[PDB]
């Protein structure tokens, strides 16, 4: 159809423009890394309103060689993030990350979205290993679990990245119902690839076989369990396009939740907030007000669109209650907003994280440049960098993603 073809043509245009800005911005990062290597860069002391958005420098030239090394590792971190964004902008699929504190109902929500009791769901801490659900066409139609062993690479990210269906040395095969035995084994597995078919449902009601976009769901291990587990959730975030953040109604957004949201918000201006266990709350209106106020503070653009992105969903499994015909307008409304965001609003759902991150990073570089401008060799460098990064930020702000 016309409006579908129009979204595709707009999506391709925006993807071209963002890729171009990513490459230019990486060059500025490379230029800043070389300059700092020969003449360490002055870092100003920032109050809270003027704190940098992406370049996390705990230290300043007034109060803090060791500052130079923190800067270098900051640029490396940003470079890795820009590469991850560039991979995502070029990837046709949409990866959805379902995360939150332990025991908020993450796996129950994934079962809800898949309309079956597939992922282990339990009163006590359960999911210790990233569980990615994909349609089985990627695995030649075969429904099974590929369990990626930690011991195939030095780091979990590297184990994940060397997995190939074509190379059996990178995974163990297991049946779908071995999953309750697999998801606790974070001392053994980096990640579970869970391949399923959904052949009895039409594309209109099938999330994984929707017929226009390849989607995978990643069920996260919980926040606030272990330092290593939290660090892995923090870094998996930048390799995924969309976050669904799951909130326990009794606790609202805890400090561990806010630390994740605040880190993800460097690129994810928009994200879903799904509040579970609201059915248990006695003072429902006071609870709802608390949650909404925290979202306003942590994710103001999500708050403006709260009707599309904030949902209260009590569906859980503790005959299959996830494919039951019983009416559930709360879940139905979440499923509809998710499909609309992912399938129809691709420029926003896929590409807004790239624009948001570039905008904030260019801002930071603009601030550093202004701070480092009147050796005189260094003066000319920061004048060129100021003028170039200013122009690039204006170009990124030109890119209009709200065209669907
Ligand atoms: N009453 C109620 N129980 C829920 C809800 N969501 C999840 N549960 C239950 O809470 C427990 C934890 O769910 P689980 O999905 O394992 O949470 P996860 O650890 O965050 O993945 C399970 O017993 C679920 O059945 C909800 O909205 N209401
Ligand atoms: F019990 Be975990 F938060 F899936
Ligand atoms: K649990
Ligand atoms: Mg779980």
Curated annotation (Swiss-Prot):
Q: Changing residue 219 to K does what?
A: Abolishes respiratory growth
**Gene3D superfamilies the record matches:** P-loop containing nucleotide triphosphate hydrolases (3.40.50.300)
Q: What is the effect of changing residue 107 to N?
A: Abolishes fusion function, MDM30-binding and MDM30-dependent ubiquitination, but not localization to mitochondrial outer membrane
Post-translational modification, briefly?
Ubiquitinated at Lys-304 and Lys-350. MDM30 and UGO1 are involved in ubiquitination. Deubiquitinated by UBP2 and UBP12. UBP2 and UBP12 recognize distinct ubiquitin chains on FZO1 that have opposing effects on mitochondrial fusion. UBP2 removes ubiquitin chains that initiate proteolysis of FZO1 and inhibit fusion. UBP12 recognizes ubiquitin chains that stabilize FZO1 and promote mitochondrial fusion. UBP12 deubiquitylates FZO1 only after oligomerization.
Protein residues bound to GTP? 103-108, 276-279, 314
Species name = Saccharomyces cerevisiae (strain ATCC 204508 / S288c)
Subunit comment: Homodimer. Dimerization depends on GTP binding. Component of a large multiprotein complex of 800 kDa. Binds the cytoplasmic domain of UGO1 which binds MGM1 through its intermembrane space domain. Interacts with MDM30. Interacts with UBP2 and UBP12. Interacts (when ubiquitinated) with DOA1; the interaction recruits FZO1 to CDC48 and promotes FZO1 proteasomal degradation.
Family of this protein? Belongs to the TRAFAC class dynamin-like GTPase superfamily. Dynamin/Fzo/YdjA family. Mitofusin subfamily.
Q: What is this protein called?
A: Mitofusin FZO1
Misc remark: Present with 1000 molecules/cell in log phase SD medium.
Spell out the subcellular localization from the entry.
Mitochondrion outer membrane
Q: Can you locate the Glycyl lysine isopeptide (Lys-Gly) (interchain with G-Cter in ubiquitin) cross-link?
A: 304, 350
| Organism superkingdom | Eukaryota
SUPFAM superfamilies found in the cross-reference section:
P-loop containing nucleoside triphosphate hydrolases
Q: Where is the Dynamin-type G domain?
A: 90-353
- What's the entry's take on its domains? The GTPase domain may regulate the interaction with UGO1 since FZO1 lacking the GTPase domain binds 5-fold higher amount of UGO1 than full-length FZO1. The coiled-coil heptad repeat domains HRN, HR1 and HR2 are required for the oligomerization and function in mitochondrial fusion.
Query: Could you tell me which residues belong to the region HRN?
Result: 10-96
The listed outcome for residue 103 to A is: Abolishes fusion function
Q: Note the effect listed for residue 78 to P.
A: Abolishes fusion function
Mutagenesis or variant effect for residue 127 to A: Abolishes fusion function, MDM30-binding and MDM30-dependent ubiquitination, but not localization to mitochondrial outer membrane
What is the recorded function of this protein according to its Swiss-Prot or TrEMBL entry?
A: Essential transmembrane GTPase, which mediates mitochondrial fusion. Fusion proceeds through several steps; first mitochondria are tethered together, then brought into close contact, followed by the formation of a docking ring around contact areas, and finally membrane fusion. Fusion of mitochondria occurs in many cell types and constitutes an important step in mitochondrial morphology, which is balanced between fusion and fission, mediated by FZO1 and DNM1, respectively. Functions antagonistically with DNM1.
Q: Which InterPro entries match?
A: Dynamin_N (IPR045063), G_DYNAMIN_dom (IPR030381), Mitofusin_fam (IPR027094), P-loop_NTPase (IPR027417)
